[PDB]
Homo-oligomer: A and B are copies of this chain.
Amino acid sequence: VTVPNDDWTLSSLSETFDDGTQTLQGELTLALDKLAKNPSNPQLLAEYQSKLSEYTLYRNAQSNTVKVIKDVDAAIIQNFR
């Protein structure tokens, strides 16, 4: 839960992204274990592909958002002088 208000941190944004994507992590873990059991089921492969792609997208979005907010903060800081 992040709102553009007084109290929220970058770590708060990272935890917000992590908690928003919670079912996908567990489903990816289950699919990974199932694939390790037998890597020949087409349905298993398709589900694992979808889960891995969504996980990659989530990681990239989180990292880019944190980088952009850090750049904004750095830009604002230098105006002190």
Contacts and interface: CB of A to CB of B under 8 A. Distances in A.
Nearest to A23: B11
B3 A29 contact: yes
Give the dominant DSSP class at A's interface: helix
Interface residues on A, range: 35 or more
B56 A68 contact: yes
Copies of this chain, whole number: 14
Contacts of A37: 7, 20-21
Contact of A49 (B8, B18, B49, B63): B63
B20 A54 contact: no
A55 to B, nearest CB: 8
A61 B39 contact: yes
Nearest to A51: B11
Interface string A1-43: 1111111111101101111110011111100111111111111
